[PDB]
Amino acid sequence: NSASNSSVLLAVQQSGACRNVFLGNLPNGITEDEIREDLEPFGPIDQIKIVTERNIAFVHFLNIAAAIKAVQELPLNPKWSKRRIYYGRDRCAVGLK
């Protein structure tokens, strides 16, 4: 089959957002070091703020393309697919973006 299921394909059809990446479905205990080491090989990040209390993380990918490939690869990966990531509209992209 070919569907979203628990993956945000609604996010893969988006663009036009540099450094703007929001993760809203992480496990408790997730640390930036993990996301860094995982996302930096395709997209180096300068700012990663994880609110484990709400299972959400705000990532800032310095290069626009770094965010693109990362946000496109995150949903395709077994670890990151567990998380809901999209291009953050505006800076307050946590619910209303």
Swiss-Prot record:
Transmembrane segments: none annotated. Residues 19-90 form the RRM domain. Negative regulator of sexual differentiation. Acts by repressing the transcription of meiosis-inducing, ste11-regulated genes until cells reach a critical level of starvation. RNA-binding protein that preferentially binds poly(U). This is Negative regulator of differentiation 1. It comes from Schizosaccharomyces pombe (strain 972 / ATCC 24843). The chain holds residues 188 to 284 of 529 of the full protein.
